[PDB]
Design a protein around this ligand. Structure first.
Ligand code: NAG
Lengths: 194, 102, 107
């Protein structure tokens, strides 16, 4: 009955890039979802499976927390069955998603003097990412009939691209730290309750 | 608004240090490209000191200037081609009368 | 192609991936047997500038196409390349430039 460590996921200092989103398994702990729903700080709290303020006393065998950083206009793509360059090539939630999506603006933590270029996303990819797939490889995407041979050039684009987060961007173009809590149920005793 | 290049096709032998001058009088941002015969020119040194994502053939991407007798001093392993320089002041984003190494 | 000495010029290249705040898209001549000459760059926001040549080229990232036109093509014959500039340090994404190939002749 030790409290689940949400102070290491939400309060972490270095959130992972979206194309290499950090994944943390949570099990064998009691989860308190009351310090979370009514924190009044999260700009986005959308639960696509179990209703938010009822899953406090609901038990799951594993809670997988996916942490990353995306733009404000790209948090609408963290949902089952969506489009864009985040649901397609970076992080695709399955159509049978059973969990919650949490997103709080981080213009005070991930925007530097002239731009925080430390967060990247997968701009180019051959095929869309299958649900919960993670493609960290930086192979040179090919956009023409000419073979790339591993040397980057015209028609051979570097797949990744850098968010230009600044403190003086529009509300859309400001960073939003995002944590996706995906609950799963298996044929094993539940270990995550409230 | 010239970028006069002095050497006029210097060449002695392979495996030697060749120094190409760029005696342009200009502000910063002067770039260096290499073009092999019958090929598309490619970037070597963008902001007059740094190195592009490449040059793994001698890895002697040399830029020592901004006093504007600019220089690239590099080795010559199997890497014979023509070498060009480019101003960046955005009205005449010009090039230079590059030199060969044969 | 073997364009006529006053038929308008028109070349196109395929460019993918937006206009992310620093990206050039320039066009470079190369007269046959002579040194490099440049014709126009379009920056990432909207800024288009040229040489004293009256070119009329425009990029468009939707439809993913760079277009380089002209008006008069008297006698010029060269080899035209499509560059891709990034002259602003974007963190991991180093500034770069990469060129295509393509020719033109007149009569
Ligand atoms: C993060 O830490 C602060 C104090 O250190 C605490 O008030 C807050 O609840 C923590 N965040 C979460 C999600 O528990």
């Amino acid at each position: 009955t030790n409290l689940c460590p949400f102070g290491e996921v939400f309060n972490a200092t270095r959130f992972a890039s979206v194309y290499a989103w950090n994944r943390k398994r949570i099990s064998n702990c009691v989860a308190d979802y009351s310090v979370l729903y009514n924190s009044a700080s999260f700009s986005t709290f959308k639960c696509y499976g179990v209703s938010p303020t009822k899953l406090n006393d609901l038990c799951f065998t594993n809670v997988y927390a996916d942490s990353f950083v995306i733009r404000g206009d790209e948090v609408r793509q963290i949902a089952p069955g969506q489009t864009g360059k985040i649901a397609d090539y970076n992080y695709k939630l399955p159509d049978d998603f059973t969990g919650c999506v949490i997103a709080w603006n981080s213009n005070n933590l991930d925007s530097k003097v002239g731009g925080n270029y430390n967060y990247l996303y997968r701009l180019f990819r051959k095929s869309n990412l299958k649900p919960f797939e993670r493609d960290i490889s930086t192979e040179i995407y090919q956009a023409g009939s000419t073979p790339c041979n591993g040397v980057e050039g015209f028609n051979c684009y570097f797949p990744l691209q850098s968010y230009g987060f600044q403190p003086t961007n529009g509300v859309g173009y400001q960073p939003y730290r995002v944590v996706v809590l995906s609950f799963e149920l298996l044929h094993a005793p539940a270990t995550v309750c409230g | 608004i010239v970028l006069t290049q002095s050497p006029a096709t210097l060449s002695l032998s392979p495996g030697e240090r060749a120094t190409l001058s760029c005696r342009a009088s200009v502000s910063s941002y002067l770039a260096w490209y290499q073009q092999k015969p019958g090929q598309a020119p490619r970037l070597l040194i963008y902001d007059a000191s740094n190195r592009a994502t490449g040059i793994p053939a001698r890895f002697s991407g040399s830029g020592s200037g901004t006093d504007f007798t600019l220089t690239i001093s590099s080795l010559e392993p199997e890497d014979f081609a023509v070498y060009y320089c480019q101003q960046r002041s955005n009205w005449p984003l010009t090039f230079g009368g590059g030199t060969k190494v044969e | 192609g073997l364009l006529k000495p006053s038929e308008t010029l028109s070349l196109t290249c395929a460019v993918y991936g937006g206009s992310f705040s620093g990206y050039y898209w320039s066009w470079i001549r190369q007269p046959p047997g002579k040194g490099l000459e440049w014709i126009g760059e379009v920056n990432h926001s909207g800024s288009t500038n040229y040489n004293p040549s009256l070119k009329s080229r425009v990029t468009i990232s939707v439809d993913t196409s760079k277009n380089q036109l002209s008006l008069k093509l008297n006698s010029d014959t060269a080899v035209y390349y499509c560059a891709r500039g990034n002259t602003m340090v974007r963190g991991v994404i180093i500034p770069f430039e990469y060129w295509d190939k393509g020719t033109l002749v007149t009569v």
